[model samples]
Target: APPEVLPTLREWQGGQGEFTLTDRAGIVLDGVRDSRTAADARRFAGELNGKASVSQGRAARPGDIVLRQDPAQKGLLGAEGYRLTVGTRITVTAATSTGVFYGTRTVLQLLNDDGRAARGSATDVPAYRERGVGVCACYINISTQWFERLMKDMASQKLNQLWIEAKVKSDTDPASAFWGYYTKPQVRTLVAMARKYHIELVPEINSPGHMDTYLENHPELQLKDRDGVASPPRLDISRPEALAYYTSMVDEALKVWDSRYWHMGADEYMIGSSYPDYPQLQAAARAKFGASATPDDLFTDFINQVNAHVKADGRSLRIWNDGLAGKNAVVPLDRDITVEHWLSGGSIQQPSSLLAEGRPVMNSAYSLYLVRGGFTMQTQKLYESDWTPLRFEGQTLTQGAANLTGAKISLWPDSAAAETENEVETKVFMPLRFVAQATWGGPKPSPTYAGFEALARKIGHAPGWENTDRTPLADGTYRLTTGAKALAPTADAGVSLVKNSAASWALTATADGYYTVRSTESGQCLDAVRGKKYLGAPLEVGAELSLANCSTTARTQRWQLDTGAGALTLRNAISQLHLTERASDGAAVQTTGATRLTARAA
Candidate 1:
C-alpha cells in the first residue's frame, strides 16, 4: 500500500518496527496541561484503539503514548514542530501545546494494521512560517458544516491559516451584496472550530475593487466611472461616506472574528479621473499634506486610517500587492502590513518586487488559485512552484526567502450561490492538500505524473482534474494555434507552434478514445517526449506525424482531446500539461497557459 498521508514527511529514518495499539494503551502528558489540547489527542487515541485513557499524574508506561513539551527540545522544535519516536512506547515531543497537538495527529496517521503503529523516528517542521488558503465566502457561501469539515482536513494536512473573504449582512444597509450571510452563530461555530484545529481565521473585507456585489446594495459607496456613472463596483476612496462604511465593516469584523491579522483589501482600485470626489480629494491631500500628493496618496491615506483603526484594536494589516506596485504609489507602503502577491500568467510584476523592497509577502499567484475544473493550477504546478522568491534585482535568493513570509492558495468562485457539495470537495479539498505540502517545507515531492497519481489514489484525492464538460473534437485536419501562434513544423526535426500557419495537424483516433495529432507539413507527430514522464516535460507542439515509426503503444505520442464549443484542449498523456501558448508571439509553444486552441480545418 502507498503512504496513507499526503506530503510524505520532512525527515524519516529506520522503519525499525511496529507497535500495536490496544485497549489498555493510554496517553501521558508532560509539562503544563491544556485540557482542550489534551482531549484532542485522547480523542484520536480512542478512535484508533476503541478506548483511550489520559493520565498526567503518573509516569508513562511501556504502551503509553506520551505527548510532552520539552524545554530542552525548544531550540530544536519550534512552536509547530514535532519529533515522534515509536517503539515499546510512542513518544511525541514539541516546544508548545500546539506542537503537541500536531504530534498527536501524526501518531494517529501512522496507525495501520488495525491500530498498529509504525515504529520510526521522524522530525518535522514547516518550511514556511505561514501556510494558508483564502476562501471567497462572498462568492460562494459555504455552509457551517462544510466549512468545519474543510477545516478538519486542513488540520490533518498541517495547514495553519485560513483567510475568509467575507461579506457582512446588515438590515440597515439596503445595498448589502452578501449572497447569503454566515449568521453570527455560524461565524461563532466556524471560529470555534478554527481554534480547535489550530487554524487562524483571517477575515478579509474586499474594498476599493471587487465590490460590485456590495456596490449593488449601496450605490453611494461606489466609485464613479469616466461617464460619471456613480455606481462602479470599486469603492470611491475619495468619499468620506465610503471610508465610514468600510470602518464600520472592519469594526464589526474585529468584534466578530478573533484573529491577530486583519485584511483591508486595497486592490485593483483602478478608479481614474472619473470619481466624483477625485479632484476634491486630490486637492485636499496636496493641501493637507505636501505637493507630491497624487490620487494614490488619497487612497493610501484611507488605507493608513484603516490600518490605524486595526492597530488600535491590537491587530496587524494585510493587503494585496496592487496597492504597492508601480510608479503611481505615492505613499510609502508600511512595513507592518503583509502583502499577498497574486499576479501571474503574463503579469510583469514579480513576487520578488515586494521582497526586494523589504516587505513580507504571501504567494497567491493565479497558478495556485483553485478554480473549479481549471488546469491553470493543476497539482503539478502547485507542488513545484517554489513559493520562496528566488530572483530579484540586486538580491540573492536568501534575501528573497527571508522576506517571503509564506504562501496561500485562493479560491474565487464565479457563481452566485455556494458551489455544489461535490464541487467543494472536488475543487477545494484535493488541491488544498498539495498547497499544504508545498508551503509546509522542503524536500518537495518529485514533480512526476506517476508520483502524483499514486499519492492521489492513496489519499482518495486527485491533484489534477479534467474539465467536467468535455467534448470530442471533429475528426479532421485542423490548424492549431496557442493564441496567434500556429502548430507548424520547424526546419529541424523538432517542431514549434509559431505565428501564422504554414501547416495543419491531422487529428486521428487511436485504439482508445484518445488522439494522435500529427503535423501535416513534416509528417511528424506532436509527442510528449519518449521515455520521460516528469511533471513539466514539454510536449512537442508540431513534431512530425510519421507512419514509419509512430508507436501506437507510446502514450507520449498520444493526446487526449477535451473540448467545449469553439475550443479544443489537447492534453499530453505523459506531462499532463495542456498544449499552451508562450507569452512572446511566435515563440515555441510551451505547455502552460491559454491552452484552449482554435481549430480551423485545412
Candidate 2:
C-alpha cells in the first residue's frame, strides 16, 4: 500500500517493498543545513525511536532516512515544497527548511503498526503561499505553554501564518496601562516558539472599530454627534491626533513582533449608525481632497497613510475587505494592500470583484467562520463540500486564477469572554484541519471522509501535546473538588457544591475531549440544562446541573476535561461554561484562578 498522509501528499508513487524502522535505523542530515532542519531530524528520530545522525555530502547508508536542502529542487519545489523517495533508504529534499520540515511530517505519518515506510516517491507543495489560523488576545487570554503546543500542532499540519490580535486599549495612560496584557515574557516566548516551528506570526492590531474595550480608554479619540454624544469602541481616525496615537501603538507592537506581515483589522463600523459623529469627518474629507470627495474618503485616506507608514518600515500591510468595501468610493486605497475577504453584500465587496481589481486577497469567507453555537463546522461536511479556497458565497474563482495569496479560519465570534482558552483549543481542531487540507491543495486518498478522518486520528496532535481530544478516561474513580467545595448530587438528581459532601464519579471519555460524569451510587450521569441567550451570547442562567440517563448524542450531557497539575476543569460541551460557574444568569465569563472546579484521581 502507498504511504497514507494527511492533507494527502500531492503525488505519491508506490515503488516496491517497505523499509521497516529498526534500532539500527537513523536520520542523516547533510552538513550544509540550517538548525531548523536539524531540529526536524531530531524530532523525527525521537518519534521513530532513533537518534539524529549526521552525514557529509549526499552519501547515505541503507536503513537511513536522509534530509537535505537542495537548490536543484528550487525550480520544481518553490519555497514551501518538498520531495521524498523511499527505497532501501529514504531521502527527503526541499528548497526551504519549511518544506523539509513538512516532508518529515509525511514520513512520520507513513509509519504503520509494523513501523515501516513503503517504497515510494512523493513530491508535494502548498497551493497557497500562506496557510494560517487567526487567534486573539482581545476577547480571551491564552497561556504561553498552551500556545507553544498550538504552534507545534500547526507546524505538523504544514500551516505557516498566524494572524494574532495582540492589543486593545482605549484609555489614556490609565492605571496599569500595560494591561494591553501579554507580559514581556509571554510575548518573547510566543516569538521564539513561532521561529522554532517556522510559523509566520502576523500581529493584528484591530483598530478604528471592533474595539469596544479600546474606546473606553482613549476618551479624546471619541467622536461626538451633533447632540454632543459619542459611541463606544471606534476611534476618530479622521483626526490627525487619533492617527498619530494609533501609529504610536503600532510602533510599540513592531518593536517586539518581528513579522513580515502586519494585519490591521479595519472592520465593521457604519458612520451613521455605529458612529453619530460622521458629518464632521465628511466635512474634513471634502476640504482636504477634491470637492468630489465624500465621507468615505476619510477611510481611504486613513488606510493609505497607514499603508505608506507600514511600507516605510519594509513590511507588507493587510486589512479587512469590508472597510475597503464600496465605502472607499472617492479616494481609492493603495493597490498594494492585501485585503482579507470576509463578508459580502452591503458595504463588503465580492471577493471575485477584489481579484479583478488587481488586489491580492486572503479568503476569510465568513462561510468558514467558527461561530460558537450559531454555526458549526463539522469535519465531515467540510470534506464533502465542494468549497475550496477558490469558492466563496458570492464568488468562485476558476482553478489557476492568480492573486489569492491564501486563506484563514477566524476564531473570534465576539466571544472574548464566552469560552475558556482550553475549550477554544479543542473546538477549532476539525475546522482548522479542513482549512489546512483546503489551503494545501489537492485533497485526495481514502477518496472519502471516513478514510481522511482515520488518517487524522492516527497522526493526532503534534509532539509534546497530550490533549489530542481523543484520549480515553483512565480506569479509576475521580474525586471532583473546587477549592474546599465538593460536587455533590442532590436528592432531586441535580448537582451543586457543598461543604464536606463527596461524590465518587466515574468519568467516561467520549469523542474529542468530551466526557460523561456518572455517579457510582445513583447510576445517573450529570446533565447540564440548556441556557438562554442575550444578543446571541449565552446567559448562563437556569442552566442547572442534573443527574440524568446518559445518551451518546446528548451534547448537554457531554463535558470537556481540561487536565493540568493533577486537577482538571469540566467545561460543558454545549454551553461552554465551566461546571460550577453556570449557577446564574448573565454573560458567560471565564472562571478565575481558585474558583475553578478542580478534579483529581481518587
Candidate 3:
C-alpha cells in the first residue's frame, strides 16, 4: 500500500555494493543490517517501502528522492560529520561510519517537510578538536559496574585523575590462601574501555611496608621488637630476603602498568606503638661490634636503602616524612625523591627539612584531611583554606612547588565506625569536589553556595545533603531569625551594655559564669546562665561574641554584651569597669572614637 522508492549515490566514497534491507519476518524497521535469505531481504524491502512513504511523502514527488538501506552494515552510524551534495548526482561523504548514519538522519530531516532551514550554510567549513580526559586510579578487585559508573561520571565532569587504594583480598590478614593477581585479559579490557572514553589509568602498589598482606606467606621478613611482638612498623629492611621480595613486586607491577609515577608507603615505622626496645636492641648490637650505637641511625639507614632499591628499578622514589625528625628521623634519599610533607606548620622551610633539601614537596599534612560527617564545619576550615602559603618558601622557590608537581588532599576513614559517621563523611567530602579543581590549578572561585552545589551533584554528592555555602559563617555565632536583634545587658544579671544609643551599648559583666540574654524582638533566648562565654578568653563585646553553649562549669560562661553606634561585642560576662568598653580591660575597638566591633581590630 506504499510507493516504491529507490535512492542512488553516483559519487559515494564508501564501498560500492548491491544493497538490500532486512527485518524480522513481520515488522517494518527504520534500519536493518542482517539478512540470511532472499525472502528475508524481500520482506525487509517491503517494510522499508511503507516506512519511506510515511517518512517522506509530503516533501517531494515519488521519483524525485531515493531511499537507501543496507542489508549488512558494520560499525556505529552517528551524526558527527556527514555531507550530501545533490547537484548533478547524489554524492555522500562521511568522515566515519557514524558520519554516514548522521547523513541518513540529515536526509530524513530535509525530506520531513517540517519547515526548518538547513542548520549550516552551504559555503561554511569548520573544524573541531576532540576533547580528552585525565588518567584515573582504581582498585583491581572492585566491581566492574561500580568502576564503570565512576568512569562515566568522571568523563561527564571532564575529570582526568583516578586513584583507588584498595588492597588485594589475599593481602589481608590470614592471607595464607591462594595468590590471585590481575589477569592480562582483564587488564586489556580495562585499558580498552579507558581508551574508548579517552581516559588514562594509573596502577599503584605499596612497597617496603603495607606488605603485611604480601608478607602473610613469608612471615620471616617481619621485623619483630625485643618483646617478641611482630613489628608491623617495619619489614626487616636489614634482611636480604626482603630486598629480593620487593624487587620482584616492583617488576611485576611495572609490567602490568605504564604508570610513570610510583608510590612507596615508607611511613609509620612501629605503626602499632613506640618500639623502645627495638631501638635499644639495635643500639646494643651496634655497641657490641664497636659500631655507631644510636637506633635513630639504624632507621635512617633502613629508609635510605629502601629508597635506593626502588629507584634502581627505574621508578621514582616517593615517601612520607613522619620519621624524619628528632634524633632518629630519616633523611631525604636525594633531591629527586618526592618529600610528602605530612606534618603541619612551616614544614618545607626548616634547613634540615626535606623541602629545604631541594626535592618536590607535596603538602598533604594529616591536619588538612577534613573529615566529612561529624565535625563538618571544623573540617571545612582545613578543606577551604588557601594552602598556597605552604607551597612557597620565605624568599626562594622550591623547584616544583610553583608547577604544583606535588600536592594531595587525603581522606582518612579511621573514625567512629557508626553508619551515621560514614554518612556525615560523605556529606562533608562530597561538597569538596571543587577542592580538586583547586589542586589542579583551576579557577579559585569563592566557595559560593550555588557553585559548590553544582559541583557536588556532578561528582555524585549525596542527593540532597550539601553545604549550600562554601564560606560557612564563623562557627558558633547564632544567626537570628531577624538580623535586627541587638545584644544588650541583663538588668539584674550583673552585665549591662553602656548604651551610646539603641544601635550601640558598652559591655559590663560580673566576670562570673551566670548570665541571661535574648533578642528583644522575637524574644529568642540567645544566652542564659553561660559558662565558657569568653571563647578562648573573657568576653569583650563590640567584636564577635563567641558564646559558649550552656554548661554547669565556670570555664567560659561569663560574657559582657556591648553595643556602639556601629558595632556590638560579646565580652567576658564577669569583668567590671565595663571591660568591653575600655581598651585597657582587654576590650576590642574599631576606629578612634569608633566602637570596636572585632577582636582582630582590637
Candidate 4:
C-alpha cells in the first residue's frame, strides 16, 4: 500500500515564523531589497504564512513575502534572498555577491508551482519536518579521453556526483574485459583531471554478479547453482565472511581514491540464496535481523548490513536501480539511491514520481547515456531531450524534493558501437545537451525564434532554421536534395547493386526485375523497387536513401545497421534485437526475398 495522504501547506502569506533576516556579518536588514529578489521572497514568505492563493488572476498581498539584501558583508552585497534551513529562518546570506543569486533560485525552487503549467491542479506541500540528505555518485567507464570532455561539461552543468565501475581492460588481452581491450592508462589520468574540474569520481568495484570474468579466473569465491555449475558469483551478504570481503574492497579503493560516497553494487545477483535450503536460511536471517522472511527483507538486510560496514569506515553508501527494484527488494530510501534508468525497452519514465515518493533519483538510463558520439544522430536526440519530472496530483515543492534535486543522464557504453569514436558520435552530444538543459532548468529558448537558434549555433549545434517545426515530417515523402546521384539499375537483374559497390547498398533482385532500397544511414526505405531504376536516396547524414527491396527480405528492411571492422548485425525495429543469424554454417534461407539471407556487418 502507498503511504498515508497528508494535507499540504500551500498559501504564500508571511509572518508564520519569526523573520530575522541578517547579513553575513549577522546584521538585520533595515529595509527590503530589489524588486525581483523581493518578489521571490514574497512568494516564498506567502507560502510559509499560508496566505498565498493558487489563482493567477487574484492580486498578491503587498509584501506578503519580503526580500532583503545588505551591503555590509563583502561579496554579500546582494545576498538578501530566501534561504532553506531545516529549523531556522528562511534568512538568505552569502559570502559572495553571486551567492545571493544562487540562494534566490534555491528559494524559488522551494516556492515553484511547476504543476500550474502542466495541469490546472493545485500544488501542495508536505510536512516541514527536518530530513537529512544522503548522496551517491559513481563514474561510468566510457573512455578516459571521452571522460575528460564529459566530466568538465557535466560539472559546468551542475552534475557534481559521479561513480566509476572499474577501469575496464582492453579486449586484446584474452583476460581483458571489453573495456580493457581498448582503454589505456591515459584514462585514469583523465579521471584525475576530471576532479580538478569538480567532477568527483567514486570508484566502484563490483563484487558478485557482472564479475564473471574475474570469478572465472578465481573459482574459490564462486557461487554454485542448483546444478553445481559455477553461476555468476554472489557475495553471501548473509554471511560474516562476505561482509569482511566487501569491507576489504572498500579499504583498497580508498587507498587510491578519496570520495565520501562508495557504491556497493548489489544489483543483478543470480545466486539470490547463499544457502539452497531456503527455509533454514530464511529462518536464520529472519531471527538475526528480526524481519520477515521475504526477498525484499533479505535484500534490505543485506543493504543495511553493507551500509553499516561502510559507514563505520566513514563513508556513505549507494546502489543501482536494480538493487532496489529487485523482487523482495528494500530500497534504502533514507540513503541516496542513484537510479540508472537504462532504456532496456525505452527511456526511464516518471523519474519525478520517484522524487515525489520521497527518494532522490538521478537518471542514468540506457536511452540517454552518451556512449555514442555527436556523429550519431541519436546523439542529437539525447542532447535535445529535457529532464522535466512530472508533479503529482497535489504534491507541492517540499513533497517533491526529488524533483528539486533534478536528474543526470547515464553514459553506458554497450551495444554495437566498437571504438571510442563510435561511443562519442552515437552518445555524447545528446545526453550532454540534456544535462545542460535539465541542470539549467528554466524556460527553454524559443525553438522557432532566433534566440534558440543563436544558442544552438553558439554551442556548435545545427539549429532548426526556416521555421521548421521538425516535429513530424507529416507532409509527404520527398528527397532531401536533388542531384544526389541515383543508384540506377545497369542490368535487369533482380539483385541490382545500387551504387554498384560494396560501399553502397545492393538493390534487391526481384523475379520480376524490380528492386527495393533504403538509406543505410537513416531507415528511409523507398516504397517498392520502382520500375527498372534504382533512384538513390540521400547519402548525406540527413539524406535518407530511398530504401528498395526488390524482395521483401532485404538487409535495409531492419532499423540501424552498425557496420564496423569484420562485424555486422541488423537491429530490429521494436526489440532492438539483432536480426538473428541462423546457427547452421550452410544455413537454409528462410525467405525467398533478401530477408532470409543474413550478412555479417562489413
User: Which candidate achieves the best TM-score against the true structure?
Assistant: 2
- lDDT by residue for model 1 over 100-157, one digit each (tens)? 8777766766663366756677787777778887777663455455567677777777
**2 or 3: which has the higher TM-score?**
2
lDDT of each: 0.65, 0.70, 0.37, 0.37
**What value does the lDDT take at residue 72 in candidate 2?**
74
Candidate 1 accuracy as lDDT? 0.65
TM-score of each: 0.69, 0.78, 0.44, 0.46
Among all candidates shown, the one with the greatest lDDT: 2
Error of 2 at 295 (Å): 2.4
Ranking by TM-score: 2, 1, 4, 3
lDDT digits (tens) for residues 1-602 of candidate 2: 55677677777788878887767676777636677777667777787655545544557788887887886778899988988888888778888888788888777777744678779887888888888888765533455556787788888888898888865232333431433356545677789989988899988777777655455656778766656677667777678987887677676676678777788788875643433356777678878886666656787788788888888899888898876557555788788999988877665678777888888888887767765444655667767765678876576777645788888887664543344445667877777777888888865556688877777877788876653444435745777776666776765666777666676788877654567888876878887643443223333433566778877755566666766665677765544446654445311233322235566677
Native-to-model Cα distance after best TM-score fit, residue 419 in candidate 4, in Å: 4.7
Error of 2 at 387 (Å): 1.9
Candidate 2, residue 201: the lDDT equals 91
Worst 10 residues of 3 by lDDT: 1-10
Candidate 3 per-residue lDDT over residues 1-602, each given as its tens digit: 11010111112333232122212112221333323222222322332333322232222221222222332432221223334543222223443333333333333323333212222212101111111112112111222333454444333332333443433222233342222234445455555555443344544455455655466567787777778777553567656676676655655555555444455655655321344657654654365333644454455555566567666766665566654545443332556766555553332234235544566656544543443222232334433654432443232233333322433444332221211222333443432343333343323334554544543443342112232221222222332111323234334332233333142221222222123333332333323222222212221223323222334333233333344444444433222212233334322221112234432110
* Model 2 residue 440 distance off true place after TM-score fit, in angstroms: 1.2
In candidate 4, how many Å is residue 523 off? 32
Clashes of 1: 10
Clashing pairs in 2: 139-416, 170-214, 170-217, 170-218, 171-217, 171-218
